[PDB]
A paper describes a structure:
Furthermore, the residues seen in the electron density maps are L136-S311 (L142-Q313, MtxAΔ1−141). The overall structure of MtxAΔ1−141 has two distinguished domain architectures: I- Ig-like fold (MtxA-Big) in orange, and II- TPR fold (MtxA-TPR) in green. MtxA-Big and MtxA-TPR contact each other extensively in a parallel orientation with a buried surface of 558 Å2. The MtxAΔ1−141 structure displays two protein monomers in the asymmetric unit. The two monomers tightly contact each other with a buried surface area of 418 Å2.
Because of its co-localization with putative signal transduction proteins within the same operon, mtxA was suggested to play a role in magnetotaxis.
Numbering used by the authors: 136 to 311
Write the structure that this text describes.
Amino acid sequence: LKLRVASDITLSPTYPDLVWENMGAQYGYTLVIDGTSHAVPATSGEMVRFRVPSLTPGAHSFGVTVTEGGQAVGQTEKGGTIVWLSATEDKALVDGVARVKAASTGDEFALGNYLDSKGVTVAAMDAYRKHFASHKDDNDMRPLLIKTYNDLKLRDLRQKEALVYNEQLEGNPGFS
């Protein structure tokens, strides 16, 4: 019940989703962004995912309270910072994504890597997950997915991904 969240994350109207660690299906969450409280349903999925409704462009502080039966049971110790993109920045991000998709057709890694470079860590995570789902053996790039999970503080996912990486190292002829 030591929930942590990303220290810094970029979101935008095109990529509005925030993610944090699922503390257990018994728990709901209250996501607080600059004093506005959002009631987040409990989930049994691999992570908690919440579409942030439109914020004003710029920096916003957020924290998360863990709740059980509507009662606070835990809380982020340090919050994080959301940077919400302006209309102009979001148009550029959207054009960059389009450029990368045109130039590297079907390449989910290239897409994830571009989004990652702009701080759009949840969208980078989605693209990377697609990449590794179809190129499970691309171990050299896997640390970027590991780092993404680590940045979002998705502890279990990070541990699992690290185990995949190690098992793939260990599969090398002669290694173990």
